[PDB]
């Protein structure tokens, strides 16, 4: 496996870790996306303490309107964050 291929499996994995906690096992409810941002993206995103942040983040990501973040929606999220960090090497 290349670093890249592993990196892709890691993204699938982190998503599985949090999306299976509660509710729909294949999507992220707000609490899970919150726990995921706070536990796994602490160095890239300000810790989320206010509900209104989670709501706004979910509103951005939920493009099919079901109130949750499915996997493809999660990749879009990962591309945003990664694209923000990369400007460090713009």
């Amino acid at each position: 496996m290349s670093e890249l291929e592993k990196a892709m499996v890691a993204l699938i994995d982190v998503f599985h870790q949090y999306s299976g906690r509660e509710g729909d096992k294949h999507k992220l409810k707000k609490s899970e996306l919150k726990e995921l941002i706070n536990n796994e993206l602490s160095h890239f995103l300000e810790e989320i303490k206010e509900q209104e942040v989670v709501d706004k983040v979910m509103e951005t990501l939920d493009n099919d309107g079901d109130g949750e973040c499915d996997f493809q929606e999660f990749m879009a999220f990962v591309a945003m964050v990664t694209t923000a960090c990369h400007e460090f090497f713009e």
């Binding site: 941002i37 993206l41 890239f44 942040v53 951005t60 964050v81």
Partner: peptide, 9 residues
């Protein structure tokens, strides 16, 4: 580090 709600696309 940035606030998560500012992320857009």
């Amino acid at each position: 580090r940035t606030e998560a709600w500012k992320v857009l696309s």
